[PDB]
A paper describes a structure:
Inhibition of the protein-protein interaction between [name] and [name]β represents an attractive alternative strategy due to the crucial role of [name] and its selective involvement in the canonical NF-κB pathway. Here we report the structure of the unliganded N-terminal domain of [name], utilizing the coiled-coil stabilized [name] construct modified by four additional point mutations, designed to improve solution behavior and crystal packing. The crystal structure reveals that [name] folds in an irregular dimeric coiled coil in the absence of [name]β, with discontinuities in the heptad repeats causing an underwinding of the supercoil in the ligand binding region.
The regular coiled coil extends to the first two heptads of the [name] sequence, to residue Ile65, and resumes after Phe97, encompassing the last 15 residues of the [name] sequence and the C-terminal GCN4 adaptor. The interhelical spacing goes from an average value of 7.6 Å in the regular coiled-coil structure to a maximum of 11.5 Å for the stutter “heptad”. The most notable characteristic of the structure of [name] (51–112) in the unbound form is a more compact packing of the two helices in the dimer, compared to the [name]β bound structure, with an interhelical spacing reduced by up to 2.2 Å. The helix axis in the apo structure, between Lys90′ and Val104′, rotates towards the center of the bundle by about 35 degrees. Consequently, several of the side chains now occupy the [name]β binding pocket. Analysis of normalized B-factors within the [name]-EEAA structure shows increased values in residues 65–92 of chain B versus the remaining residues of the chain (all positive values, i.e. larger B-factor than average). The only accessible pocket in the unbound conformation of [name] is pocket II, which represents the point of maximum opening of the bun and where CASTp locates a pocket involving the same residues contacting the ligand in the bound form.
Author numbering:
A (entry chain B): 19 to 142
B (entry chain A): 20 to 141
The structure:
């Protein structure tokens, strides 16, 4: 047969020792694959969260901005009506000051006239 | 004591078991390297997303710094205008009072002038 009993028993023990190594290797790789898929699950969980935060930061920024534009607009309207009031009041104060000057000019004339006339009453 | 034939057949049985376990080693090796590479792409996506996250937060912080200063400045002009409105409204009231007084002074001076012209025959 060419191979004797002793030669085949020796080969059989070599194949058994090789099965033992390959079984150990299968066990080691099953354990690495398991830990690797666990780590994959944590990274997909992390990615999703980072994205959920990105999306909420972006909507928040849009509501805040619309809110800000509404209060800036209302404050500007209050400022502009106050500034118009300043200019209107300035303009009425000036027309009134001008009237008062005419009135005082008339009063000056009327006081000169009563003086002239009182001197003439003192001489009749 | 096993015969040559029985041992040859066991030899072949052990070779088939070896061939199965070599297929299982190669299957596992390929799933693992696929999963290691998928994890490395996820860690590169996480890095990028967090960097963007950092940049937005810094841009937002300085943006709200600038908005708050613009609003404080506009509120400051409004308050100053209001102070001016109050003061000017008081000065206006005083000038209007003076106007009314002067019209009464004129009306009485005119009556007096007329009475004096009578007296002097003018």
């Amino acid at each position: 047969g060419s191979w004797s009993v002793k030669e085949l028993e020796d080969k059989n023990e070599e194949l058994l020792s090789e099965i033992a190594h390959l079984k150990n290797e299968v066990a080691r790789l099953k354990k690495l694959l398991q830990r690797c898929l666990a780590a994959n699950q944590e990274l997909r969980d992390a990615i999703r969260q980072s994205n959920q935060i990105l999306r909420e930061r972006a909507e928040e920024l849009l509501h805040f901005q619309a809110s800000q534009r509404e209060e800036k607009e209302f404050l500007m309207s209050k400022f502009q009506e106050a500034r118009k009031l300043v200019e209107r009041l300035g303009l009425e104060k000036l027309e009134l000051e001008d009237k008062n000057e005419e009135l005082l000019s008339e009063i000056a004339h009327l006081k000169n006239e009563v003086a002239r006339l009182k001197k003439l009453v003192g001489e009749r």
